Design a protein around this ligand. Sequence first.
Ligand SMILES: C[C@@H](c1cnn(C)c1)n1cc(C(F)(F)F)cc(-c2cccc([C@]3(c4nncn4C)C[C@@H](C)C3)c2)c1=O
Ligand code: NA
Ligand SMILES: [Zn+2]
Ligand SMILES: [Zn+2]
Length: 384
Amino acid sequence: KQAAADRRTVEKTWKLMDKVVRLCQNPKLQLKNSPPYILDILPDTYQHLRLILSKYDDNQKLAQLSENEYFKIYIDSLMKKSKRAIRLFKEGKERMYEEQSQDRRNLTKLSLIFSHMLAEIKAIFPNGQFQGDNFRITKADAAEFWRKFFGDKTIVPWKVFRQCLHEVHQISSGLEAMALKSTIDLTCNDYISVFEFDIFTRLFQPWGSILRNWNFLAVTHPGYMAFLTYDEVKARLQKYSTKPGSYIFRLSCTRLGQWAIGYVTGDGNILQTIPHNKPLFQALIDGSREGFYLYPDGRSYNPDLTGLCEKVTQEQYELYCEMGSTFQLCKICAENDKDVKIEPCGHLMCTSCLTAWQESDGQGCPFCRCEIKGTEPIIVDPFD
Ligand SMILES: C[C@@H](c1cnn(C)c1)n1cc(C(F)(F)F)cc(-c2cccc([C@]3(c4nncn4C)C[C@@H](C)C3)c2)c1=O
Ligand code: NA
Ligand SMILES: [Zn+2]
Ligand SMILES: [Zn+2]
């Protein structure tokens, strides 16, 4: 539950965003101007929040805006991530100036969240006017799923989304569900907006086999690079410039819902292409037969993708989860946050799963099976 996103609350987020900008302006960080660039994103977020306030110019319009379900969640998430960025700089101390530290890695995670949130707020409020109830999901079969389970909702909790998705496309485990949350919930707010659903369904289309497409194209494919920048894609492929057909594919933080395939040409140049509103695996199979996409990340083995026209280990899901912000969520259910600590092993989970486990005569801790000497309520942050 969130409080009303009134003018006073919207302004509190501006002051927090301002603090983050000054922290990130420190030249000891040697911050790359490559996307997501927090120094462009936060002022652009402020300008969009002003554009929204200029459209709702009277007290009655402001009251309607303050009680908008999506707007309340958005302002609360914006406040939370800004406070989190301030805390990261405080606790990080000198580790913020170490490009390879976990504190800096967390800053990249926040920068990506702020980037995704800006694209989301511009899609839901184009020109500062709410259009969430009129948001058009690109894929019709995916739009019918959203309309069936969520009606005209602009945003739904992750918990409800995952349960309803499972009715159509089965999710085989807690780790898979955790990996799926980090892929769809781009803003890391424990909700799925109709815009995040549109991005995910555009990337892993067709809808009919979306989870097989996601598992084969992203979780386990050696060519998949997530939001690795164009410069890093070219520098990664530079090592294989003597192997024509070496290719990698990435997501674009400035072009959400689109893929960018970098590859080595016959003359050793590294070129890129953005496939149309077509399935990524189709472009990859087309490119394989034509001779452009043969070696995913220079690897001589190109996985056979032709099965998607008509398995993943727990370890594979665990590795995939590292780039995300899912540490705060119970690993057993992947729907409730961790709120309880076992003693003396220290394993964390939600109370509901611990109760289910104790009521099943499960011996000791569900993770390690050491005797549960006691429990303690806790609050976990994704960066612990
Ligand atoms: C810049 C880029 C990168 C860097 N090296 N590489 C190979 C990729 N990057 C870096 C981070 C970092 F942890 F902050 F460092 C985090 C992500 C990242 C953050 C959240 C979700 C994801 C997605 C994801 N993709 N694979 C796993 N996840 C979990 C791609 C989404 C649709 C889910 C990636 C990322 O993209
Ligand atoms: Na989200
Ligand atoms: Zn749980
Ligand atoms: Zn344990």
